[PDB]
């Protein structure tokens, strides 16, 4: 009943969201930082390949590895495909205003085809056509 | 400033395969090669920023 983070969660549970955003931000982020540091520390001491490990170590690693997974912004990370295939201050973009809002004038007058949320939409030879898992699963089987 | 600069110039004049085998046999090198440290800093910064931004984005979509 004296740990800095063990009272933070309790006081958040009791008081609730009656305070401003920053206090809730810090109170939630403390435990996240602690968890990431612990998991990274355990992972460092390990080996890489799974053919050189015992049973208990393999189970521990496979259980605790998954907390580093990310799902939403993979494409932005991976776009850096351009090097494998070949061999911007918002204003130059079309369909986006300076305040990161949609520009209706161009999209309604000039008949803009698509909106370049990210780079690589200018010109483009990397394709990357959207798919559906179930169609592929039926196709294979 | 440091007295190990001469080590830096002679280290720099090596074909990458030479450095690879020198590390592999374990005889010499690893703390004085001016590329690994840059790799660590750049990749650490990328990892931290991307993790934070992904967390906030998924929370907003929640």
């Amino acid at each position: 009943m004296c740990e800095p983070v063990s009272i933070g969660l309790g006081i958040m549970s009791v008081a609730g969201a009656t305070m401003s955003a920053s206090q809730q931000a810090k109170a939630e982020g403390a435990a996240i930082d602690a968890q990431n540091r612990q998991a990274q520390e355990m992972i460092k001491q390990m080996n890489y390949s799974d053919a050189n490990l015992k049973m208990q170590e393999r189970d521990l690693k496979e259980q605790q590895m998954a907390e580093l997974t990310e799902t939403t912004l993979n494409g932005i990370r991976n776009q850096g495909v351009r090097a494998a295939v070949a061999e911007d201050t918002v204003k130059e973009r079309a369909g986006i205003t300076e305040s990161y809002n949609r520009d209706y004038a161009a999209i309604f007058g000039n008949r803009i085809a698509n909106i370049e949320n990210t780079q690589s939409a200018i010109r483009g030879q990397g394709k990357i056509i959207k798919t559906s898992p179930l169609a592929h699963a039926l196709n294979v089987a | 400033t440091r007295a190990d600069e001469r080590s830096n110039e002679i280290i720099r004049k090596l074909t990458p395969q030479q450095r690879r085998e020198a590390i592999q046999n374990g005889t010499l090198l690893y703390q004085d090669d001016p590329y690994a440290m840059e790799a660590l800093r750049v990749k650490t910064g990328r990892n931290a920023a991307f993790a934070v931004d992904d967390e906030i984005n998924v929370k907003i979509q929640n």
């Binding site: 939403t72 993979n74 494409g75 085809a113 909106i115 949320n117 939409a121 990357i128 | 984005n57 979509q61």
Partner: peptide, 17 residues
């Protein structure tokens, strides 16, 4: 609720008159 998030798109297609 919130079954699964929606991945961010590269670029999006629209239409006009």
């Amino acid at each position: 609720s919130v079954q699964a998030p929606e991945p961010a798109p590269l670029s999006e297609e629209v239409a006009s008159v």
